[PDB]
Design a protein around this ligand. Structure first.
Ligand SMILES: O=[N+]([O-])c1cc([AsH2])ccc1O
Ligand SMILES: [Ca+2]
Ligand SMILES: [Ca+2]
Ligand SMILES: [Mg+2]
Ligand code: NA
Length: 329
């Protein structure tokens, strides 16, 4: 995969404990994870888990009441993943039989028929993945399958490559672009309509990096296209609306999973300081696992669109203007 991202310090220690073979043969870049504290007790599913680097990492972070599932279709990668279950149970939880992980073989677009067992409806709290979408062009079925396995309050928390415009037919047929995850890149606005068709009505930017195309033969197929690496979080929450409405609410981060909670690029909550929120963000806080570390005030009368944020114009803007402006400048 990419050059991608720097490994956060809290993970470094845990990676030193992970079997060297799992690390050595792992395909692609690490799945990024929500703040570590927020994972305790969660059920996490990694799509495209490979040899299990991210599954084993999460295994420790979710603790013994948490559970982790990895899914993949590369036989060679799973055989490796499957045979370090005990290794890691001992090393994390003092015994070979106390494992909170499992590995499933199947296409990520169809988790219900993955091979030891399927993933049932409404059973996962967090689905993670890094750079898996641009390799299939049935993105839609993949988004609907993630919607299906998530419980209410669950999130798809993921990184992929997107484009600031629609690639040409020629760019989408190119095999070098394809294998770099560029050629299957969605236009951000098409991505937004598509995950909303799958049921995720609200997409929050966590971070964005520029992705460059340098080879001058390649650049000719995608001449003014700007590509981005975006981490988004998309919550499955029954009451989310298409718009960000002010109902007079504020939320207060109570402490206990960091100095401050960073929900997305528009909303940071310093410990014990109330922050005005739109009702979608109130509802995410309330119905997701995050409620344990927050206090959210009651809905008042509808006050119109939410403006009580210092980037409120960008907050309401299409996804490509958010990404474009938050990348740099
Ligand atoms: O660099 N990338 O972002 C990248 C992403 C994926 As997916 C595959 C190969 C690559 O070089
Ligand atoms: Ca992976
Ligand atoms: Ca642009
Ligand atoms: Mg409100
Ligand atoms: Na384990």
């Amino acid at each position: 995969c990419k050059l991608a991202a720097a490994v956060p310090e809290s993970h470094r220690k845990i990676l030193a404990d992970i079997a060297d073979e799992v690390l050595e043969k792992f395909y692609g870049c690490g799945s990024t994870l929500p703040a570590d504290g927020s994972l305790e007790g969660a059920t996490v599913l990694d799509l495209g888990c490979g040899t299990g680097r991210d599954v084993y990492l999460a295994s420790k972070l979710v603790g013994e009441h948490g559970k982790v599932i990895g899914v993949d279709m590369l036989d060679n990668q799973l055989e490796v993943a499957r045979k370090y279950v005990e290794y890691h149970a001992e090393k994390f939880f003092g015994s070979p039989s106390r494992s909170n992980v499992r590995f499933l073989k199947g296409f990520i677009e169809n988790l219900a028929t993955a091979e030891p067992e399927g993933v049932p409806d409404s059973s996962v709290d967090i689905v993670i993945s890094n750079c898996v979408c641009n390799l299939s062009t049935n993105k839609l079925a993949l988004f609907k399958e993630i919607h299906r396995v998530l419980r209410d309050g669950g999130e798809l928390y993921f990184s992929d490559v997107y484009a600031d415009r629609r690639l040409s037919e020629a760019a989408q047929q190119d095999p070098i672009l394809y294998g770099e995850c560029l050629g299957g890149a969605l236009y951000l606005e098409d991505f937004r309509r598509l995950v909303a068709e799958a049921g995720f009505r609200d997409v929050r930017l966590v971070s964005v990096g520029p992705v460059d195309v340098s080879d001058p033969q390649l650049r000719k197929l995608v001449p003014d296209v700007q590509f981005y690496s975006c981490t988004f979080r998309c919550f499955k929450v029954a009451t989310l609306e298409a718009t960000r409405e002010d109902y007079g609410q504020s939320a207060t981060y109570l402490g206990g999973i960091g100095e401050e909670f960073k929900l997305d690029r528009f909303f940071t909550f310093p410990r014990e300081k109330p922050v005005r929120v739109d009702r979608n963000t109130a509802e995410i806080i309330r119905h997701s696992r995050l409620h344990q570390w927050f206090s959210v005030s009651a809905e008042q009368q509808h006050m119109g669109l939410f403006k009580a944020n210092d980037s409120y114009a960008l907050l309401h803007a299409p996804l490509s203007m958010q990404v474009e402006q938050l990348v740099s400048g």
